[PDB]
């Protein structure tokens, strides 16, 4: 239908739509099967149904974890991406932590990221940029002054 007046707002329908399309893009950038871990492969379906209007019940958002295959330093950083019924419109929530990384370090990384993603316009994807961002700015953080190198004996 339609009303007489209306301020500024968007219908979840669209949001979800952009949340499903981005999936096809992410899968492409990730050829490895052990990359994108979807809590449930049916998380995308339930949604497609809501778009029709048959399912009045709000479907489960698209939440998963993407592994950052850092080329150098050759390390792994588990990235927990969560796209609610708002994003991209809303600032999604990400979590970057690795066994190597430390408490102080993480903070710096996460912070630097959150801001980067918080500088995007409500309409386009952001998680697609968070991946590259981290990679390019992944070692910059690790790089630290610590005496670990040393000889060995028997």
From Swiss-Prot:
State the superkingdom. Answer: Eukaryota
Name its species: Homo sapiens
Record's protein name: RWD domain-containing protein 2A
From-to range in the entire protein, with total length: 1 to 141 of 292
- Which residues belong to any copy of the RWD domain? 21-141
């Amino acid at each position: 239908g339609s009303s007489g007046s209306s301020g500024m707002s968007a219908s979840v329908k669209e949001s979800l739509q952009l949340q499903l399309l981005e999936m096809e893009m992410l899968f492409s950038m990730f050829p490895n099967q052990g990359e994108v871990k979807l809590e449930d492969v049916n998380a995308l379906t339930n949604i497609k149904r809501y778009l029709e209007g048959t399912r009045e019940a709000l479907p489960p958002k698209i939440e998963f974890v993407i592994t950052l295959q850092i080329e150098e330093p050759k390390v792994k950083i588990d990235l927990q991406v969560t796209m609610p019924h708002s994003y991209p419109y809303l600032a999604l929530q990400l979590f970057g932590r690795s066994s190597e990384l430390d408490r102080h370090q993480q903070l710096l990384l996460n912070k630097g990221l959150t801001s980067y993603i918080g500088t995007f316009d409500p309409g386009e994807l952001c998680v697609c940029a968070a991946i590259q961002w981290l990679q390019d700015n992944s070692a910059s953080y690790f790089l630290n002054r610590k005496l670990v190198s040393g000889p060995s004996s028997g």
